[PDB]
Design a protein around this nucleic acid. Structure first.
Ligand SMILES: [Mg+2]
Ligand SMILES: [Mg+2]
Ligand SMILES: [Mg+2]
Ligand SMILES: [Mg+2]
Ligand SMILES: [Mg+2]
Ligand SMILES: [Mg+2]
Ligand SMILES: [Mg+2]
Ligand SMILES: [Mg+2]
Ligand SMILES: [Mg+2]
Ligand SMILES: [Mg+2]
Ligand SMILES: [Mg+2]
Lengths: 59, 116, 172, 60, 171, 131, 100
RNA sequence: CAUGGUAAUCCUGCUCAGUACGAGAGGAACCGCAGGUUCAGACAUUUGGUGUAUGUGCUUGGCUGAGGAGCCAAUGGGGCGA
RNA sequence: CGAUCGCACGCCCCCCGUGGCGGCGACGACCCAUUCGAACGUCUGCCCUAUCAACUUUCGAUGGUAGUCGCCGUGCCUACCAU
RNA sequence: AACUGCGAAUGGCUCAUUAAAUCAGUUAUGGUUCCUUUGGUCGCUCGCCACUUGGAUAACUGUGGUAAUUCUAGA
């Protein structure tokens, strides 16, 4: 492993937004709790109360 | 062992050979010998001269794919998180489907009761 | 190399502005010293290291290496925490602003030096190591003292004491 | 010369400054979107093949 | 070199606030108790504006000159009415007085020039729109009872003389 | 630094070459070359990068009947560039300069020889391309 | 063969030295021209002077030695380069026909 | 080797050095480095010139019945040319 | 030959019980009409000058035929003719 | 903030060109085009996603190049 290059995988800032893409990612076939299988991004800044933000799904 | 140049005739011009011609319009040409430079300066077409490589190429004389998807973690849902979500195949997905079904049923019954 | 108007946003708070003028006798390298200052620093000014800089902003000035008209520049620089520790005056942040003026140190005492010291509070007196204190150095120092300027000295052209003269360290 | 090295499978792009022309001579005389072995970059880069994605001229 | 020079001039050269305290009496010919004099001493960018023009450097065009000087009090902006008053002006008399707004305030980056909307006291700034109403020196103020600034004490005098005449007499 | 190597001259006194700047002159008639000590019966001659004295034959009247310093920038005589390339141009051309090697014009049409370019930095600035 | 060339070629040009023959023994490659015709005997002598200038005492490292034909305007360095560029000819075609 | 002949010359740029000197403006030199001018002695790898290899194409008029192959026109002309 | 978005939200429940249905719009459109026009044409009308009386027609000048191009009519352009 | 849509072809200035040219009045386009507004048309065709299909790029995070621009590259 190259130091700091090929290790310490960083995450994507945001996941799928189109319901087809959420189903493609999570291997959903059809009509199984799609709106609650979406990824919720947690905001946890020190100066404010923590909460989690969910994206507005499309299609 | 300098840069290796090519001619009017397309031949290889080694260092110390030929002449370089710099035209007024900025174009720079180099020739292997005076035979090539005379043909060029007389506006002769190299594709009509049989020993030129352009003729031998015009007349044909003598002669990957992949799709890799790499999985990555995302903010809020780690790689293990998305693995646990996508591995809900053994009847967990069916359990979620049936609990959604009964939630819809109880919502509809509550709506009917409230309307009536 | 920040915006121009942040110079206004810095000069709003005083105690970080240095109104300074460079004074010396002829050919004592004040122009080149200010060139080095320009090269390192700069609010919108460049970082070019190629000899002449914004000291002589005219023909027949760098054509004959003669400063004729006094020239003013304004530079910005943010200092480190140890630098703010070392400074003993009042300090409002690290964003120090320098109003530099070079003046003709020619033996006519071109009154542009008088004008620069009228505008200026602190003088950088440049002297050559191998030439000593010449005539115009004393003249511009006299003018600075008459105008109540705070002087700071700089021995310039040490290279000719090193190699042109080949002086031993005790002699230097 | 500098090298903007990026590993898309993990992200984490970083800049490596290379001075010795022997390291860059394996890169020279190539084109964009070409895969070359980075084994000339010392032992640390052995087993690595890298694609030339782009760059910027001396003037930017 | 620039690093060493800056790290010594910041330490040892004085700020305008501390300098103008002992320097105001040497540049202002008005009585020290005057409001303009006190504003110069404090260098407050709100009160009795006081600017002295030391230089008149030619502009890009031939005829015009940027009037370059220092602001000792107040805050010069763009297009504010000010009293351009010359060296010979006395507050009692109207001679060598003008009320003229200034066009624009600029800062000289040597070769470059950068306009700025406003400049408070304790800094250097060039003004455009002053050279045609002024000559060889002058002062700018918003104070109606303002006194002049003390003129420069040149070490030399206009000794050497030359008679000049055009080659074509009809010019 | 670096001093210009000897090249084949091919432009003796009496040569009329093109004037490649936007000064307003059409051609330059070479009347002498700078730095020529001379020899009996030998015409002074110039190559690219050489400073000549020239009079313009076709061009503006305010230029026409006067001697101007000029610098040769292109020559039709082939010359060897110390790396084995023999280079020649499509025409002979020069530009009008002052005694300091500063161009009277502000632009150059066509290429400028490298030998002239590195010898005269002011001409190299106004040069379009370097050959 | 220079270290920048790495070609299995000798100093002999393509087609041999014109009016001399083929050089097989040791040779000395001197800068510039030398008096005499081809195959003229020359006497080489140590310098009577002391070589102190920068032109002397300079390391000459060759990058490339030309071996094109001198019997005309040669344009190839080796037999194999010529054959690789030019491909099979009629003579080689009939020779391969005879060889089978 | 007796004897006779005899040969090299001058300039510019960089550095010295914006230095010595000078109030200033101006402004050197020695060493070293890189190249030129004139001259000399060669040489043909390269570039150019020549070219009746009368080498190889093209071509005019004529001639050998035509083709093929050639020739004559005081080197027919012309391109490229060892 | 609508895979779009908002607003309050309601009806049918036999078959049932989770589905089927509904109003107000906004956006969108191939084409038609209108509005705004635009573009090219019809007739008639312009200062001084003959020390400007014959022009145009090789190279479109006038017209015909068939085309090209142009949003369209047309030497706008091409070819062939007539003068 | 950025993508998408629209506007930026209006207005304003000047009078150099221009002498059957522009332009004024008149008439025609059955010889043409027309954003937008408004009104028509949008189940008029028989012909294992439709409870809704695919891919990319912005914005954004991060690594830069250039002296410089409303310059931009890779990921
Ligand atoms: Mg949607
Ligand atoms: Mg004679
Ligand atoms: Mg040969
Ligand atoms: Mg003797
Ligand atoms: Mg002699
Ligand atoms: Mg014949
Ligand atoms: Mg025949
Ligand atoms: Mg006969
Ligand atoms: Mg005869
Ligand atoms: Mg020939
Ligand atoms: Mg007009």
């Amino acid at each position: 492993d190259i130091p700091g290059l090929t290790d310490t995988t960083v995450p994507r800032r945001l996941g799928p937004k189109r319901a087809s893409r959420i189903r493609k990612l999570f291997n959903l076939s059809k009509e199984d709790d799609v709106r609650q299988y979406v990824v919720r991004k947690p905001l946890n800044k020190e100066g404010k109360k923590p909460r989690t933000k969910a994206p507005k799904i499309q299609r | 062992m300098k840069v290796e140049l090519c001619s009017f005739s397309g031949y290889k011009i080694y260092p110390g050979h030929g002449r370089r011609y710099a035209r007024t319009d900025g174009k720079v040409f180099q020739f292997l010998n005076a035979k090539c430079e005379s043909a060029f300066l007389s506006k002769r077409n190299p594709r009509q001269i049989n020993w030129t490589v352009l003729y031998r190429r015009k007349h044909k004389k003598g002669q990957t794919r992949r799709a890799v998807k790499f999985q990555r973690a995302i903010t809020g849902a780690s790689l293990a998180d998305i693995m646990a979500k996508r591995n809900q195949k053994p009847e967990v997905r069916k359990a979620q489907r049936e609990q959604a079904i009964r939630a819809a049923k109880e919502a509809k019954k509550a709506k009917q009761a409230s309307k009536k | 190399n920040f915006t121009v108007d942040q110079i206004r946003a810095i000069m709003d708070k005083k105690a970080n502005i240095r109104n300074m003028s460079v004074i010396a006798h002829v050919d004592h390298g004040k122009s080149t010293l200010t060139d080095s200052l320009v090269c390192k620093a700069g609010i919108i000014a460049s970082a070019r290291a190629g000899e002449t800089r914004f000291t002589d902003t005219r023909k027949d000035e760098q054509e004959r290496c003669i400063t004729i008209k006094s020239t003013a520049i304004s530079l910005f620089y943010e200092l480190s925490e140890n630098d703010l520790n070392f400074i003993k005056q009042s300090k409002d942040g690290a964003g120090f602003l320098i109003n530099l003026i070079d003046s003709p140190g020619h033996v006519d005492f071109s009154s542009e030096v008088t004008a620069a010291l009228r505008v200026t509070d602190g003088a950088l007196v440049v002297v050559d190591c191998v030439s000593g204190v010449c005539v115009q150095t004393e003249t511009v120092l006299r003018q600075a003292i008459a105008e109540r300027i705070k002087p700071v000295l700089m021995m310039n052209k040490m290279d000719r004491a090193l190699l042109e003269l080949q002086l031993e360290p005790e002699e230097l | 010369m500098k090298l903007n090295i990026s590993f898309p499978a993990t992200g984490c792009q970083k800049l490596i400054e290379v001075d010795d022309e022997r390291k860059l001579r394996t890169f020279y005389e190539k084109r964009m979107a070409t895969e070359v072995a980075a084994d000339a970059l010392g032992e640390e880069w052995k087993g690595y093949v890298v694609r030339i994605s782009g760059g910027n001229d001396k003037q930017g | 070199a620039g690093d060493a020079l800056l790290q010594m001039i910041t330490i040892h050269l004085p700020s305008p606030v501390t300098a103008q305290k002992y320097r105001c009496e040497l540049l202002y010919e008005g009585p020290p108790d005057d409001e303009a004099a006190m504003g110069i001493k404090s260098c407050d960018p709100k009160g009795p504006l006081m600017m002295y023009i030391s230089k008149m450097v030619p502009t890009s065009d031939k005829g015009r000159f940027y009037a370059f000087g220092r602001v000792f009090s107040g805050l010069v902006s763009t297009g504010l009415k000010v009293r351009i008053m010359g060296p010979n002006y006395t507050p009692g008399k109207k001679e060598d007085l003008y009320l003229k707004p200034i066009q624009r305030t600029i800062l000289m980056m040597g070769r470059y020039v950068e306009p700025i909307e406003d400049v408070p006291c304790g800094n250097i700034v060039g003004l455009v729109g002053v050279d045609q109403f002024l000559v060889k020196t002058g002062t700018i103020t918003t104070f109606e009872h303002a006194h002049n600034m003390r003129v420069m004490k040149f070490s030399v005098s206009p000794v050497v003389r030359v008679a000049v005449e055009a080659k074509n007499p009809a010019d | 630094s670096g001093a210009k190597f000897r090249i084949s001259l091919g432009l003796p006194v009496g040569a009329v070459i093109n004037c490649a700047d936007n000064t307003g002159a059409k051609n330059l008639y070479i009347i002498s070359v700078k730095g020529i000590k001379g020899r009996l019966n030998r015409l002074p001659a110039a190559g690219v990068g050489d400073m000549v004295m020239a009079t313009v034959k076709k061009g503006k009247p305010e230029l026409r009947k006067k001697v101007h310093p000029a610098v040769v920038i292109r020559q039709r005589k082939s010359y060897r560039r110390k790396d084995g390339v023999f280079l020649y141009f499509e025409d002979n051309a020069g530009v009008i300069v002052n005694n300091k090697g500063e161009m009277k014009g502000s632009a150059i049409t066509g290429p400028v020889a490298k030998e002239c370019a590195d010898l005269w930095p002011r001409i190299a600035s106004n040069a379009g391309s370097i050959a | 063969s220079t270290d920048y060339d790495l070609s299995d070629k000798s100093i002999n040009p393509l087609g041999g030295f014109v009016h001399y023959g083929e050089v097989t023994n040791d040779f000395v490659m001197l800068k510039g021209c030398v008096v005499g015709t081809k195959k003229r005997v020359l006497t080489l002598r140590k310098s009577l002077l002391v070589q102190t200038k920068r032109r002397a005492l300079e390391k000459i490292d060759l990058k490339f030695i030309d071996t094109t034909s001198k019997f005309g305007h040669g344009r190839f360095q080796t037999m194999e380069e010529k054959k690789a560029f030019m491909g099979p000819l009629k003579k080689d075609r009939i020779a391969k026909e005879e060889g089978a």
